[PDB]
Structure 1
Amino acid sequence: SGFRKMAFPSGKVEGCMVQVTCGTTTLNGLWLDDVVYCPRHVICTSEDMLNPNYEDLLIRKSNHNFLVQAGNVQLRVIGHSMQNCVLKLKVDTANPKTPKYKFVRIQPGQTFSVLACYNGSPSGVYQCAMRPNFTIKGSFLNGSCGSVGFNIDYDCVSFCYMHHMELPTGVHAGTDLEGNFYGPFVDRQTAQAAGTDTTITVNVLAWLYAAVINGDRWFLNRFTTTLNDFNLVAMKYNYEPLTQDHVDILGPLSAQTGIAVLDMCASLKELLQNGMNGRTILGSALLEDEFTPFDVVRQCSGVTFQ
């Protein structure tokens, strides 16, 4: 019992983290097989980072301009290439600690684990989600660029995120591991706004299901609602619409608890219109939307990874 923002265990990723240095710019990189992936703005100077031309800065570079270093043992660069916003640095030695891995692009509403790193060394691990506006609400200081986000599937690390920048509201933007940004953001220091964010409805229902599996029931009601009449309330409250696919993913949670998905929508509806009245749900005074149905099942059935 209990429920927490649980991250995947981070050991497999820790063994991949390295430090990439170009000029006076130092960020974190990811070393898989004989490639180190990092953000391309490592080749920028603090006076190039306004309107850089990356192809143009890169062609003026040699393999020996990249000090890549794993712990204390450094790494000889023997090739380099740009893939969108990511640099791929071929080094002369394959990472022994390389896990079974893959690169994937996730959608808004999915969650993943972040290993925040500084100078190639892990600092901490936390969970979060791809917001519907393709920001993530992370915790990132200067030099965290190059930190990755990931999910674990038994033995297989699925890298989905690399960190590039903070936005002015204080949220974060980045790319997948093929270098394409999530959202309309670019790797320069200019005026970019996050865009309007919405609450991930399917996740809020799943966390209401986690509440019931853990004994919280004060928010249930006899009430039901149609899918259409619920979406009417949800749009009023800036919640993303609920589709039949969402209803279907919540099946297992509906059947484990005996509470029909549309009944739980009637509960969510009544919580939006009334608030909470000082009650909490799973130690929160807010409706949480950064738990997927998968997260809930995992943290309510004991799914491990090795």
Structure 2
Amino acid sequence: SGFRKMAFPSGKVEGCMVQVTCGTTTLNGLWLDDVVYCPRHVICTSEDMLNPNYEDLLIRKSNHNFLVQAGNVQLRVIGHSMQNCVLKLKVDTANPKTPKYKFVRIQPGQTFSVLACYNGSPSGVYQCAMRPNFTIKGSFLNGSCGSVGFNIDYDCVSFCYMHHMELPTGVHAGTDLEGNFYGPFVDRQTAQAAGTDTTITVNVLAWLYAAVINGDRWFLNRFTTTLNDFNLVAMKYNYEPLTQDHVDILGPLSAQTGIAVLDMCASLKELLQNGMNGRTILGSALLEDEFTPFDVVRQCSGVTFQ
């Protein structure tokens, strides 16, 4: 037992990370087969991030402008093209450590692992959720752009995130690996801001089920509630509405614990209206919302990845 915010093993992604330098900008790239993917703002100079113009800027670039370090080994760039907000640097060597992979785009409420990198070298790994407002609460310093987020499904890496920027509240914004931003953000220096967030209701319920599985039961009650009347309380506390599909997705956790989903909702209702009264749940004094039902089932059953 135990419940711990768990990332996927990072080895398969570590072997894809490289350093991309152009002009005075150094950031990270992702090397898969003979392409290096990286944020297009590597082409820019401090005065370019005012109102930059990437098509104009890119036509002025040459392949030799792009220095790509794979560890202590340099790669010729033999072509370059923009795809939305990422660059694709075509190189003369396919990465022999290319895992099986997919480029997927995730939904707010879904989680993934981030391999934070600097100068093409992995620094650490941690789990994040895509917030309802399309930001992530990460840990990113200068030079971390191009770090990727991912999930692993048996032997296949599903890349879902590439880091581009921090917003003024200290949250982070980026793109999918096709270069399309998550949320209404642009890779320019503007006054852009996150915008209002909500709590991921279905994930809180999943985490309450994780707590029960691990022996925290004090918040359980015999009360129940209707889906409609729970959702009236959810809206009050700036929680997302719970749908019948959410109820269905929580079925297996409901079956394992013997606690009906709507009964767990009645527990959440009481927690929202009364607080915790000095008690904790899975070592937290807050209702936690960055574990999906999948994350709970995975950890409270022990699935691996070769």
Q: What TM-score comes out, normalization by structure 2 length?
A: 1.00
- Distance in 2 (CA, whole Å) between partners of 1:27 and 1:265 is 45
Alignment correspondent of 2:225: 225
The CA deviation string for residues 77-99 of structure 1, in whole angstroms up to 9 with x for no partner, is 00100000000000000001100
- Distance in 2 (CA, whole Å) between partners of 1:186 and 1:214 is 42
Q: How far is the alpha carbon of 1:50 from its aligned partner? A: 1.0
- Distance in 2 (CA, whole Å) between partners of 1:263 and 1:50 is 53
Matched, 1:120 2:120: yes
Alignment correspondent of 1:276: 276
- Which SS does the other structure have where 1:52 is aligned? coil
The CA deviation string for residues 110-159 of structure 1, in whole angstroms up to 9 with x for no partner, is 00000000000000000010000000000000000000000000000000
Q: How far is the alpha carbon of 1:174 from its aligned partner? A: 0.2
- Which SS does the other structure have where 1:3 is aligned? coil
Alignment correspondent of 1:48: 48
- Distance in 2 (CA, whole Å) between partners of 1:167 and 1:212 is 36
- Which SS does the other structure have where 1:202 is aligned? helix
- Distance in 2 (CA, whole Å) between partners of 1:49 and 1:72 is 30
- Distance in 2 (CA, whole Å) between partners of 1:113 and 1:189 is 27
- Which SS does the other structure have where 2:4 is aligned? coil
- Distance in 2 (CA, whole Å) between partners of 1:191 and 1:30 is 29
- Distance in 2 (CA, whole Å) between partners of 1:246 and 1:55 is 43
The CA deviation string for residues 5-36 of structure 1, in whole angstroms up to 9 with x for no partner, is 00000000000000001101000000000000
The CA deviation string for residues 194-226 of structure 1, in whole angstroms up to 9 with x for no partner, is 010000000000000000000000000010000
Unpaired segments of 5 or more residues in structure 1? none
Alignment correspondent of 1:146: 146
- Which SS does the other structure have where 1:280 is aligned? coil
Q: Over aligned residues, Cα RMSD in angstroms? A: 0.3
Alignment correspondent of 1:300: 300
Q: How far is the alpha carbon of 1:47 from its aligned partner? A: 1.2
Unpaired segments of 5 or more residues in structure 2? none
- Distance in 1 (CA, whole Å) between partners of 2:89 and 2:138 is 27
Q: What TM-score comes out, normalization by structure 1 length?
A: 1.00
Q: How far is the alpha carbon of 1:190 from its aligned partner? A: 1.1
- Distance in 2 (CA, whole Å) between partners of 1:187 and 1:289 is 28
- Alignment identity in percent? 100
- Distance in 2 (CA, whole Å) between partners of 1:189 and 1:296 is 38
Q: How does 1:82-101 map to 2 (within 5 A)?
A: 82-101=82-101
- Which SS does the other structure have where 2:46 is aligned? coil
Q: How far is the alpha carbon of 1:189 from its aligned partner? A: 1.2
- Which SS does the other structure have where 1:252 is aligned? helix
